[model samples]
Target: MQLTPFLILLRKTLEQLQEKDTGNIFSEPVPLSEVPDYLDHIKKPMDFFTMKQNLEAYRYLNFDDFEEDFNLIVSNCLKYNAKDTIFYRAAVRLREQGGAVLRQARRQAEKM
Candidate 1:
């Protein structure tokens, strides 16, 4: 249930997204016309996790409900070769941690 690993991985991904050598997901230096459409498609999703609370909100979904969004993200990433193996592995780890956290939270809430 501890989300330390998930939190750490998410933080690392954010940092990676900001690196200049790597493509900055937030700010592209090249003209829009220069970059390929796939590379340019870095707009924030409707529920982009800019803050910890946002991630917590995402992790709050029950397992059955969580799978939909999780699958969507993974599938979309694959379409653009955005499926970095390390990132995917970390994401899977986080999802497992999140599932545990959700179960613990549910149990605690039920007892309250």
Candidate 2:
């Protein structure tokens, strides 16, 4: 898959955070090394739309599987002093080319 500009920026940011201590998940900082164990205790992965809106729902979500990547991505952002609301600002502006890619695959069904 091709990396969009936003993905490029996000990857670079995570790498930079990985370099130094990321003790900034909240106002009271925690240990960078502890973020992993902290994540291990979560029941569900972070939801990008949660902090943004209530009326807005994950309508297309059940059809998608963002899990494998969302947790690690949110964890990286959190360790570097980010929260969902902040990311929301940029996420809504993803445009047709910046953020998510939703492709509908029906190959198996078609073949059947």
Candidate 3:
């Protein structure tokens, strides 16, 4: 199968987001043993690993699909953790930092 320029751009964007994740908190699924209530709150849990899998599987039909999952990752964290918690703060940081990374990637995609 041939990967298009958009697919390459999507992969690059995901890599940048993973790199920005300092503690690698969003790199994998949330540990159910620790946060047992996670699934109860977040109906659609998203993580970098899952995103990568979806990317490789070509699940994302468009850039919006990938963006939707990325937003879900941040929103799920913000919804589950309290404002004062480190998780909440980290999610906020990710939203801001990751948004910029995505914006840059989008600009690049537009150029291609």
Candidate 4:
């Protein structure tokens, strides 16, 4: 029977700890494990939300980029006639609010 991928990683992690070459990381291939007939590998993929939470609302002058991103969302919303996308408010608020929402996101990112 093949060892689990987790087991392989464990083995290689120990191999990485080998004291030689004046303390440099040695890259090696770690193969994954076997799957049995009656087993499932469950996992939750992390996506843009993690990035958003960690995301600073503003990284640079950023308005042009903001407009570009917002424009895409707005265009998609217009296409689908979707009322729920943040684009609706973003278009209005960004005009009056003037980068506050993004700045708020930046605050959250800083805390994260």
Residue 77 shift from truth in candidate 4, angstroms = 0.8
Model 2, CA-based lDDT:
0.33
The candidate scoring highest on TM-score is 3
- lDDT computed for candidate 1: 0.40
lDDT by residue for model 3 (8-78), tens? 88998999999989999999998889988888878999999999999999897577899999999999999
Per-residue accuracy of model 1 over 10-50 as CA lDDT, tens digit each: 44433332331122222322234654684456442211232
Compare the candidates by lDDT and give the number of the best one.
3
Candidate 2 per-residue lDDT over residues 17-67, each given as its tens digit: 333223323212234376666455544433333312211332222212332
Error of 2 at 104 (Å): 34
Who is ahead in lDDT, 2 or 4? 2
Model 4 residue 44 CA deviation (Å) reads: 23
- How many backbone clashes are present in model 2? 0
Please tell me which model should have the higher TM-score, number 3 or number 4.
3
In candidate 2, how many Å is residue 65 off?
13
Clashing residue pairs for model 2: none
Superposed Cα RMSD, model 1: 9.3
TM-score of each: 0.35, 0.22, 0.92, 0.23
| Clashing residue pairs found in predicted model 1 | none
- TM value for model 4: 0.23
Query: Where is model 4 poorest over a 10-residue stretch in terms of lDDT?
Result: 21-30
| Tens-digit lDDT string for candidate 4 (11-75) | 33223222221222111211125323212322221212222322243221323443344333223
- The local lDDT score (0 to 100) that residue 105 gets in candidate 2 is 24
